[PDB]
């Protein structure tokens, strides 16, 4: 039986720990992001394979999140010292190079267990991404098995859709992008859309 | 504390029930899909709002899954009788019209609870999608809060990536599509990619 | 063992939920009925067979209840959206047509379990009818297996008898209808009836 | 919480006891009735008010049940000796007179408690009636608060309905009597009834 | 393991219920007897064999108790309506005829069980008699198997003996009757009797 | 709560111990008496007051028991050495003198506690007497508070009544003595006695 | 496992009961002896064998205890009435004759069990003796199996030794008697004695 | 609550450990003494005050035990290395000097606790002596508070008494020594002694 | 409370995991070391401060262990990928450089908890060293708080002493080094060392 | 499982006991050492082998600790009396001679068990040494199997290292001694040491 504190439409489970932020160690906590959307994602291990490509994909596109009031934080079970060393490893060596996303350390595994992403037999997490709104409420959960990375395009579309539906109180159909048709969640009002 | 039987890299929890399949009631079970990938997704309620758009999006693109050895099954807590009535409601009335995807009924809520998608306060599920491989192993889990639909494009990309990595035993970086570069999961072999 | 909170001669178990009333979604509560008798009945499932005939029979004869200060509420495990769709289905198609009885939705199954009528293996209720007096006290319980409908005539006879015996403190013999002999519940007084 | 062993669609709870049958004490068992429908009914107390009218009502119309392969048995918490005294009491004194219906004695209360009809505060049953099919399965439960008697007509209508639906596998609409239209419990076949 | 609340030397267990007293139903309580001795006895069943002989033997000799400030109450598991019908049955038919002793009803079995005289296999009491003093303390317990009646003479003897020893603080030898020698309960004082 | 193993109509609780029999110490067991009725009685303490008079009353009339195939055994918590001293003490000093009834010693209190006659606050028994049949079944229980002794006449009457009803299968009315009428325990048969 | 409340150097377990003192029954308590040493001893049974010789041995030499401010109390499970009978029995018949030591009665066994001397299989005590100081602290425990009696000389020697070491704070060597050398309980001080 | 395994009449608790025996470490066991009486005694601590006097008093008188087929073993919580250093300390310094009695070491405290002589607040034993017969049954227990030594004379007296009563099946009066009168344990036989 | 499975003089707790050996990932097990002494030490974290100096000190002095049949294994909670990256970091940068000691990865924390060295609040181990003999038995445990490194010289001294005492069965005094005096563990033999 | 209260980085477990200090018995408490470092060490047994050499080693070099504000205390399960005897034993006989180090006694074993050094099978401690800082915090634990002594030099090196790191907040590399290079525990500042 799988156990987690992470529930959609409930407050995201609180976390705090040491992150590497612009080459320095800093205390970071979930509530530092109140007032903004947060994309909080776990990756298995520093110095491995799919993991740097995802951090780099989000990092290189960070201004696309920051301009819609959204922050990104990545997390693995490695220490902050390992995070720093990986950052100071050239991208060509499978390193990260300099990076604008905080890398949070979950050495005690408590944060992983709370978000239900810890693999007990391996001692690290799978690829779990969490979208948390400006009120600290968990809106979306995406978990991938180890071999397959996530999509920045898809995360962006999700954040946009949650902020849109937050604002207008209509609902976003399958595949919705900005500029797409939405639905009034009324059995009479829905007919606008379905005609 | 959230509880489920659904664990990535473990066998997907077994299910069986009545589905509507080409306008008829039929017994359907998870293991009927052994040997093929399965996209198994839950939606909140027949005769509601985001729900028909997702069923229709997958349904209208079904041959794109069937040609990569992948089936799709949708599920809600409504009865098979309600599923049939919704199918026999014109798309213009927010109905489904004829549909090639089985609609599985989870009236006892046991299947929802097993997949960890049941909302105890509402009596139906959230938007939870599950990708299960040809061996019955759970590979990917996507859960959306009620207001925001899923993406057929993204589901397809995920299925493709899991089947690719199944076959070649390399790993798929962030945003991977067919034709994209992969990584040899070796600290020496990974350097091919990172150069 | 079978369990229920519904005990004859004790206050009927409190319920509240969404009902379709006049084609609109309203909160409805058991306490809205204080001051009136209430026939509160569960039926298995919208869009089925015996179920429409029973709802229609009570609806079409509503005045016979209302003119003796009695209201009627029907309940299934279906959603309020499925209720509304059934109401908008013509009677020729097994729909209800417009209806003057509230259709209460018990989607979480709380109400059905409190009344002891929920079938664990099927995920819906059997045919359970409850007669609740104006003080909120449960007077009568009628439970039928699935294939056999209830009787509006028998329900009305029971309501009238509970009303007559509430008022006069005589008791009602077998088959009593308005205009029939009653019995004074005393070893001396009973002799007036039996001679 | 209210507890009982009696569940519709399951074997009626087994019982055995002393009954008065044609003036004599005999051991009577629920399994004596295999092969026949059984109307099994409890009444509060010998030498009381509604109770003799219900026993007489069923008694005088017994062949109406016996000619549709149905037996009737009555039960109260009173002793076999009290039952026999009551039989030997003239109808004109609230007595029973001779009757063809067995009066089963439930002095220990185990039968009452098994059928969920025992009133802990009072030490006797309410008016509970049970229709049990020829396979020993419970089909119908009718519980009345003390002041209001049951109906022979209605019991007869229900027995006929269960027998018809057993034999023809159609279902019986609200109010159904012999010669009334039934419904084919299929979404297509139902339309013959509804149209 | 046999259990009861009735202990010699301790307050007799409280009881209350409905008795037939001069043809009427009245609430009777143990505390109604404070200030008087009470012979409180159980008998198995109304309309049986030994039982009317005992009730009639104490009833017909009631003045032998009242003139020594002693009341008599009889109790069985039968309803008060059965007690009244028994009273209205002529002695020649095994009835009681009018009786001056209250007949307490113990339909719920609570009083029988508190007095340790309830027979779980039969659903009624054995023949248990209890002598309770004016202060409410249980002094004497006599329990007989079903086939053998008790003795009014022996009961009188015991009451007279307890009243004598209460008043004079001497003790009553085997077979003591009024006018008989008693013993000063003292290793010195006793010699007055034995010498 | 008062606890005991002694229950009417159930085998009398097994006992064994050392008794004084014709001035000698002997191993005695309840089962030694199988095949005959036994009057087994407890008295509080050797060298006390009511206690010798009861033992003497039975001892002096022992041939009245023996000639109806009934034995008598007395028991207290005192040791067998105390029993012997008391027997060797002249009747005029509250001693027993020679005696033909066994005096059983219950020094460990096990026998007293099994028979429910032990007084935890005093460390000895009250005056309890038991009538056990030839099959070892307990038929009668008489418990007196300390100040009041038992009756040999009443005990003989009970033994005679049990033996008579054992033999003829009729039952014995209140105050029955040898030569009195008995009752056939049958609703028709009983009318022989009452008419 | 053997259980007791009596522990050396801890307050002796409180006791109270009825003793025979100069031929009279009197309430005695352990606390009556505060301010003086007490030799408290149990013997198996009145009217037995080693038991009288021990009581007589102490009784005859009681002034040797009294003159060192020490009292003696004896106890068995026998009743106070047995104690008195035994005292009133001449020494030449194994009786005690007059005696100046209280004979405490432990009829309920509580005192024996508290002192750990009670023999569950026999229902009396072994030969146990306790030396309790003026403060109520248990100082010495001597337990003999049944066949072998205690020693007044040895008991006097112990009481004298406890009182001496209580007064001078030195300690008493093996076999110390009044007038023998004692030891200063100090690594240097001890050398006075040993050298 | 005081606990121990040592009960008079039952096999003495098994023990085994390392003893110093003639200057050497040897494994010693209780069963090594079968066929002989054993005086087994505990003393608090090596290098203390009363303790060497007791060990020396039994050692120096060992032939008084061996010539009646009795061995002596002393035990404390001290290590065997401490026992040996104590032995190699001259008597004049509070040492033992060479000794013919084994000194058992109970470093783990298990033996002390089995014998109920361990003092939890001090971490050593009180002065507890145990007389065990040739069959291994515990016959006698003597426990002294710390400040007061035991008596070799008393110990000899008890051994001689137990051996005499074992052989002759008579019992030993208070103060018995060899050559003293014993008692035939019989209410008749006893008169030979008392008369 | 602190818990561990590592007990001196008991078999060292089994472990197995992935190690970096010769720059490659290998399964390694405690049982691979049977036949050799093993120094098994935990260090807090790769890429830190005291940790490289200790690993380097043992690595650079490996021959001193291997020439006396002793191997060395280091362990932290870091992944094998972080170990490999640290090994590929030059010593001038706080890396290890190539290394001839296996670096075991304890990512699940199982091994660290089994050895009692895991710090719950920090998510890594303290400085814990374990010396395990050739039979797999744990001989020595050294635990240091974080800021203070261990000593290769002290470890080597300990290994040599355990080897010398395994071989000769003499014992090693404080500060013993090869060539120093040893002690024969006997009270007589020890005198050769101490004179 | 092995349990202990001693955890590095937490307050050393509190202790108190009798110690021998400069030839005398004194109560000694762990809190007596607040304000100073404390080397607290356990040794198996007085009058044994390695144990005196370790105490002498620390004893003779005491001022080396006392001049760096550090105290030393030794402890074994032996009594204060045995400790004093051992002190009074010439060094040439494996005795201690005078020593300035307190010898604390742990007769009850509570201190040993609290520090996790007690050997349940043997009844004494292994060789466990604990370095406790001036704030009462545990910094270092060294446990040796019985055959191998500890090192004064190494203990001294550790005390100096903890004192240096306390005061300067740098960290001490493997092998560090006074005058050796330390490390600044920061990823940038570390490079001064490593380069």
From Swiss-Prot, chains A, B, C, D, E, F, G, H, I, J:
One of its GO terms (cellular component) is cytosol. Thiol-specific peroxidase that catalyzes the reduction of hydrogen peroxide and organic hydroperoxides to water and alcohols, respectively. Plays a role in cell protection against oxidative stress by detoxifying peroxides and as sensor of hydrogen peroxide-mediated signaling events. Regulates the activation of NF-kappa-B in the cytosol by a modulation of I-kappa-B-alpha phosphorylation. It is an enzyme of class 1 (oxidoreductase). The lineage of its organism: Eukaryota, Metazoa, Chordata, Craniata, Vertebrata. Belongs to the peroxiredoxin family. AhpC/Prx1 subfamily. Keywords: Antioxidant, Cytoplasm, Disulfide bond, Endoplasmic reticulum, Oxidoreductase, Peroxidase, Redox-active center, Signal. This is Peroxiredoxin-4. The active site is a conserved redox-active cysteine residue, the peroxidatic cysteine (C(P)), which makes the nucleophilic attack on the peroxide substrate. The peroxide oxidizes the C(P)-SH to cysteine sulfenic acid (C(P)-SOH), which then reacts with another cysteine residue, the resolving cysteine (C(R)), to form a disulfide bridge. The disulfide is subsequently reduced by an appropriate electron donor to complete the catalytic cycle. In this typical 2-Cys peroxiredoxin, C(R) is provided by the other dimeric subunit to form an intersubunit disulfide. Homodimer; disulfide-linked, upon oxidation. 5 homodimers assemble to form a ring-like decamer. Can form heterodimers with PRDX1. Its main location: cytoplasm. It comes from the Eukaryota. Residues 6-164 form the Thioredoxin domain. GO terms for molecular function: identical protein binding; molecular adaptor activity; molecular sequestering activity; thioredoxin peroxidase activity. The enzyme can be inactivated by further oxidation of the cysteine sulfenic acid (C(P)-SOH) to sulphinic acid (C(P)-SO2H) and sulphonic acid (C(P)-SO3H) instead of its condensation to a disulfide bond. It is found in: Cytoplasm; Endoplasmic reticulum. It catalyses: a hydroperoxide + [thioredoxin]-dithiol = an alcohol + [thioredoxin]-disulfide + H2O. GO terms for biological process: cell redox homeostasis; extracellular matrix organization; hydrogen peroxide catabolic process; I-kappaB phosphorylation; male gonad development; negative regulation of male germ cell proliferation; protein maturation; response to oxidative stress. The active site is at 51 (cysteine sulfenic acid (-soh) intermediate). The chain holds residues 74 to 268 of 271 of the full protein. It comes from Homo sapiens (Human). Its EC number is 1.11.1.24.
């Amino acid at each position: 039986l799988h156990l987690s504190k992470a529930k959609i439409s409930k407050p995201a489970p609180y976390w705090e720990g040491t992150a590497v932020i612009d080459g320095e160690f800093k205390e970071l906590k979930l509530t530092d992001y109140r007032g903004k959307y947060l994309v909080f994602f776990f990756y298995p291990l520093d110095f491995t394979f799919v993991c740097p490509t995802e951090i780099i994909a989000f990092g290189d596109r960070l201004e696309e999140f920051r301009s819609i009031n959204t922050e990104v934080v990545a997390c693995s079970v490695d220490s902050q010292f390992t995070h720093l060393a990986w950052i100071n490893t050239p991208r060509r060596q499978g390193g990260l190079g300099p990076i604008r996303i905080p890398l949070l350390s979950d050495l005690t595994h408590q944060i992983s267990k709370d978000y239900g992403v810890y693999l007990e037999d391996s001692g690290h997490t799978l690829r779990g991404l969490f979208i948390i709104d400006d009120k600290g409420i968990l809106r979306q959960i995406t978990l991938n098995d180890l071999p397959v990375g996530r999509s920045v395009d898809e995360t962006l579309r999700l954040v946009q859709a949650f902020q849109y539906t937050d604002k207008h109180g209509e609902v976003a159909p399958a595949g919705w992008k900005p500029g797409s048709e939405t639905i009034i969640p009324d059995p009479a009002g829905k007919l606008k859309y379905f005609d």
